[PDB]
Amino acid sequence: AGANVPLITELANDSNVQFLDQDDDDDPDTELYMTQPFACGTAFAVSVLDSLMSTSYFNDNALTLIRTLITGGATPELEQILAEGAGMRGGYCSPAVLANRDRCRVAQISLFDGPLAQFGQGGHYGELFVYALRHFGILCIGLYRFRDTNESVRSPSSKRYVITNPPEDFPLLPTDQVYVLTYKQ
Amino acid sequence: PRKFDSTGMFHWCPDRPLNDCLQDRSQASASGLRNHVVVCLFADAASPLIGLRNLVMPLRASNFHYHELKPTIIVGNLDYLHREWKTLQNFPKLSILPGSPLNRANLRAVNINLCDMCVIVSAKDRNMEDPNLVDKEAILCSLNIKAMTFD
Ligand SMILES: [Ba+2]
Numbered sequence: 001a002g003a004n005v006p007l008i009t010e011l012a013n014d015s016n017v018q019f020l021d022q023d024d025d026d027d028p029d030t031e032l033y034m035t036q037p038f039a040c041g042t043a044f045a046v047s048v049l050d051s052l053m054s055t056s057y058f059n060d061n062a063l064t065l066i067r068t069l070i071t072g073g074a075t076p077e078l079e080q081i082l083a084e085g086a087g088m089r090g091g092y093c094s095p096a097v098l099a100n101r102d103r104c105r106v107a108q109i110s111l112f113d114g115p116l117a118q119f120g121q122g123g124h125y126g127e128l129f130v131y132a133l134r135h136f137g138i139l140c141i142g143l144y145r146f147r148d149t150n151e152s153v154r155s156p157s158s159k160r161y162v163i164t165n166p167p168e169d170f171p172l173l174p175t176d177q178v179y180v181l182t183y184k185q
Numbered sequence: 186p187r188k189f190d191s192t193g194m195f196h197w198c199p200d201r202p203l204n205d206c207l208q209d210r211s212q213a214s215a216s217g218l219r220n221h222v223v224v225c226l227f228a229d230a231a232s233p234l235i236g237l238r239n240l241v242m243p244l245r246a247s248n249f250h251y252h253e254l255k256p257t258i259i260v261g262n263l264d265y266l267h268r269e270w271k272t273l274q275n276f277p278k279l280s281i282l283p284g285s286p287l288n289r290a291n292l293r294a295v296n297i298n299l300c301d302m303c304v305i306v307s308a309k310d311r312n313m314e315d316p317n318l319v320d321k322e323a324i325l326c327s328l329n330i331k332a333m334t335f336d
Contacts, residue, residue: 085290 004158007042014045023157039161040147069106104183108144111176120174125166128178139181141165143172150175189247190275196245196254198277203270207281208258210294216280218256220301225286225330226261227322228308234265235308238272245276254278255302258295260286265308287326289333298335305330 011017014032018024020043024036037043056063067074082088111120111128115135119128125143132138143163148155160177163170190197208216222244224237241257256278259266263283266273273279284291286305297303305326311319 083289084293085288 009037009043011043011045014047017043017045036147036159036161040159041144041162073100073103102184104139104181106141107180107182109138109178109180109182111172111174111178116178117174119172120176123172124168125170125172126168128172132178132180137183141179141181143170144177144179145173146175149173187251194247195242196247196249196251196277197275200274203267203274203281206279207283210282210290213258213280213282213291213294214296218258218280218296219299221256221258221295221299223292223295223297223300223303224257224259224261225303225305225326226259226265226308227286227306227326228262228265229310230262230264232262232265232308232310234268235306236272237269238276240304240306241273241276241279251277256280258282260284260291260295261308287322287329289329292330292333297330297333303330 009020011020015028017032017035017037018026018028020037026035032038032045032047035043038045052063052066109116111117116128116132119131125140129140132140142165144160145163146155147157147159147161150156150158162179188197188199189195224240226237228235237259244255244257254277257276258280260282262285263281266281266283270281282291282295286292305323307320307323309322
């Protein structure tokens with residue numbers, strides 16, 4: 001399983017993304033996205049952070065939403081604690097501060113098996129979204145779907161691309177995975 | 186019972202190794218430093234020598250009684266203080282706290298709410314950069330100390 005190893009290369013120069021994959025057959029002048037590596041999550045360029053200078057101006061709440069989604073919460077009091085130079089410190093914390101211990105994390109679920117497997121049997125995305133939200137408090141952000149249907153003839157690779165919030169009537173392949181904002185594990 | 190310099194102008198102590206006064210944050214906090222003089226020294230391991238003697242020498246004049254001496258403590262790089270100790274070793278009540286002075290834990294350790302003065306000296310090699318960016322570290326330290334809170 002040499003090619004089945006999930007790895008995320010970080011690119012200092014985005015133009016190098018073309019060299020990450022050989023079966024992409026994409027034009028060299030294509031932008032950073034729309035390229036098979038970046039569109040599949042295998043590549044990541046620091047240049048994206050530069051664009052975060054724009055949105056953080058246009059949307060005041062963009063950066064604080066990004067940090068909550070990303071850094072595990074990174075409460076301001078935590079970098080006040082780290083500002084004291086003593087480093088990250090703490091012990092067996094009281095349950096009062098452990099109340100925020102069960103917050104909303106981002107994870108992936110598989111439609112191959114589980115309580116949501118029926119929606120992978122030709123179901124629609126909206127049905128899965130409403131059912132998950134009503135039954136488990138799970139917010140389906142988007143889909144992680146095979147580049148070509150994994151039948152070993154269409155494409156024998158485990159390559160998947162991301163679809164951010166597909167429409168209501170999006171068909172659901174049984175092999176598709178779902179990004180979720182799951183709460184309480 | 187007070188040992189002075191041969192000229193009789195300054196207080197004096199026998200030469201001692203650096204570790205005879207070197208302290209960590211626990212030891213610095215244990216010592217109840219009050220009305221002392223903190224010296225936030227921004228220096229590199231190979232930054233040019235500035236002669237901290239000339240800062241502590243006027244602090245140790247013989248016209249001050251021994252109990253009137255302000256206990257000078259230096260928070261800064263440790264190799265630079267190794268280089269400076271050859272000249273600094275003869276002054277009593279001196280102390281050393283290694284590590285950067287921008288680190289708030291150091292300033293908590295060497296009580297800076299209680300210090301009589303907090304000198305901020307930068308011994309780094311500057312003026313080869315933009316002139317307005319020359320004193321970035323000193324201004325940052327001043328703002329950091331002014332923004333702290335104590336009990
Ligand atoms: Ba290519």
